[PDB]
Amino acid sequence: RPGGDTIFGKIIRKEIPAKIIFEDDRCLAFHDISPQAPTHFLVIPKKHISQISVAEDDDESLLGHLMIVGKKCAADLGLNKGYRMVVNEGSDGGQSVYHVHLHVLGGRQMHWPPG
Amino acid sequence: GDTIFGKIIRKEIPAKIIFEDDRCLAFHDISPQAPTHFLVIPKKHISQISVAEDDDESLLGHLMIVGKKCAADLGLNKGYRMVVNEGSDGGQSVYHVHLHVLGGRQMHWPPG
Numbered sequence: 267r268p269g270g271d272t273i274f275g276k277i278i279r280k281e282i283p284a285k286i287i288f289e290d291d292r293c294l295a296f297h298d299i300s301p302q303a304p305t306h307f308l309v310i311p312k313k314h315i316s317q318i319s320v321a322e323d324d325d326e327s328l329l330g331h332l333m334i335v336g337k338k339c340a341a342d343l344g345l346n347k348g349y350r351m352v353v354n355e356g357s358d359g360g361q362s363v364y365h366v367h368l369h370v371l372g373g374r375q376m377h378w379p380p381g
Numbered sequence: 382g383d384t385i386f387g388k389i390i391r392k393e394i395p396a397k398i399i400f401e402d403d404r405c406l407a408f409h410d411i412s413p414q415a416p417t418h419f420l421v422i423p424k425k426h427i428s429q430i431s432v433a434e435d436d437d438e439s440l441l442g443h444l445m446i447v448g449k450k451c452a453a454d455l456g457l458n459k460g461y462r463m464v465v466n467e468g469s470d471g472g473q474s475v476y477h478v479h480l481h482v483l484g485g486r487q488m489h490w491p492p493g
């Protein structure tokens with residue numbers, strides 16, 4: 267089972283349904299089930315990486331691709347006033363699924379601090 | 382147009398530098414929102430993530446690898462949050478791409 271057996275691995279393999287925005291060989295973008303803004307989606311690698319703190323050096327281009335995909339999808343969804351991208355690491359970061367994921371939130375004014 | 386982050390890269394104004402290489406700089410935020418709050422920025426002037434080029438994808442990933450290495454070196458073993466802001470809704474404060482890294486406290490949800 268490529269993708270791992272976190273819930274996000276199951277979404278990658280189409281075992282659990284999701285509302286998918288974009289898909290390529292490297293990643294998947296899909297809407298969050300508990301949105302915290304009018305638009306709130308995730309971009310994840312298809313390669314299982316548990317958390318950013320254990321990402322390999324040669325995962326650099328993949329991580330960058332999540333961001334590029336994130337910004338493209340935000341444009342395609344009409345987030346013309348802007349958005350916030352978030353990666354959570356570990357307990358203090360609020361990480362709830364141990365498969366790396368980029369949150370993209372928009373459609374309202376985001377506030378400071380970012381939690 | 383130039384920004385304060387350009388001035389920091391050029392060493393024209395002071396910042397507490399954590400790490401530097403040929404293509405990025407990491408430094409503590411002047412307005413920290415957590416006990417540890419630093420930025421990782423490219424030396425290339427990309428004004429905002431929305432205008433990043435495809436060719437920039439490994440540079441962007443390099444910011445996050447540098448960020449996670451710096452976080453480890455700064456002792457953030459209980460975790461942290463990485464943030465990129467875009468535009469007015471995103472609360473982007475400087476029009477030079479920057480990755481925020483915050484930790485040393487529980488970060489909350491929603492992330493603003």
Ligand SMILES: CNc1nc2c(ncn2[C@@H]2O[C@H](COC(=O)NCCc3c[nH]c4ccccc34)[C@@H](O)[C@H]2O)c2nccn12
Binds near residue numbers: 284297299300362490
């Ligand atoms: C999209 N579909 C989907 N999404 C899920 C599910 N189960 C969790 N997800 C989504 O994945 C994100 C993981 O976030 C974090 O790991 N940190 C974000 C902050 C956070 C999440 N949980 C916390 C708990 C405490 C503190 C902070 C957090 C969340 O925004 C969830 O809504 C799920 N099952 C079946 C289908 N599911």
